């Protein structure tokens with residue numbers, strides 16, 4: 001299982017920057033932010049989407065909880081952790097978990113470029129093993145799971161949430177983005193529905209704060225077709241590996257989004273007080 005994930009994300013980050021943007025954010029974007037000046041890049045749409053999730057989780061309210069420890073589960077190429085270090089300058093502990101050694105090497109380089117290595121800790125760790133993270137005595141105020149659970153089988157997703165719940169502070173937020181199938185059954189010719197997806201979280205003990213389609217189907221399609229155009233512009237001789245797979249997937253996934261067969265969801269849950 002884990003070797004397949006490692007193979008998927010082992011490619012040169014410089015090639016990925018040409019495909020998905022300089023920030024290497026890989027869970028779509030929003031094209032509706034009044035602060036965005038068109039044309040809207042993948043970097044811009046991705047960050048504005050993440051900012052909208054933090055807004056929906058209550059972090060623009062002046063009396064939100066003090067963000068003292070952060071976890072990013074499946075932290076990709078590390079820009080969400082960089083953004084969060086800038087967003088919460090008083091947060092002196094941000095932890096990233098990832099199975100991809102190539103992505104973690106890039107994360108360490110990005111964080112070192114910004115002098116963030118004393119605030120951001122990196123762990124080569126499966127999501128199911130978050131119970132192994134150091135200092136259980138300091139719970140997490142904010143946990144990010146951005147485009148990761150779609151890579152998990154149902155047993156792994158349930159096991160990971162069971163491991164995560166004790167590590168979240170009461171009143172702390174888990175801010176999730178994932179790619180779901182809108183209906184349980186489609187014509188014959190890691191599938192999760194919204195009801196199933198939310199029930200894993202509430203069964204684990206979390207309380208729903210907000211769940212909605214975000215980005216919109218047409219915004220996810222825009223992100224995919226802009227990434228496809230980037231790959232075709234920057235690899236005119238032909239793409240290889242995961243970037244060729246993304247180029248092909250962009251059209252098929254965009255069609256499914258236009259037909260409303262699949263959507264991307266923002267899912268925010270909190271740990272309740274005992």
Ligand SMILES: Nc1ncnc2c1ncn2[C@@H]1O[C@H](CSCC[C@H](N)C(=O)O)[C@@H](O)[C@H]1O
Pocket residue numbers: 005009024025026027073074075076077080097098099100103125126127128145146147148151152
């Ligand atoms: N079981 C697992 N445990 C930890 N990380 C996992 C995982 N399965 C997938 N991943 C990681 O999940 C990420 C999916 S891509 C999304 C990356 C990042 N969160 C972003 O929003 O840009 C990759 O970093 C991949 O290596």
Ligand code: NA
Pocket residue numbers: 012014015018
């Ligand atoms: Na390159």
Ligand code: NA
Pocket residue numbers: 006007099100101102
């Ligand atoms: Na690896």
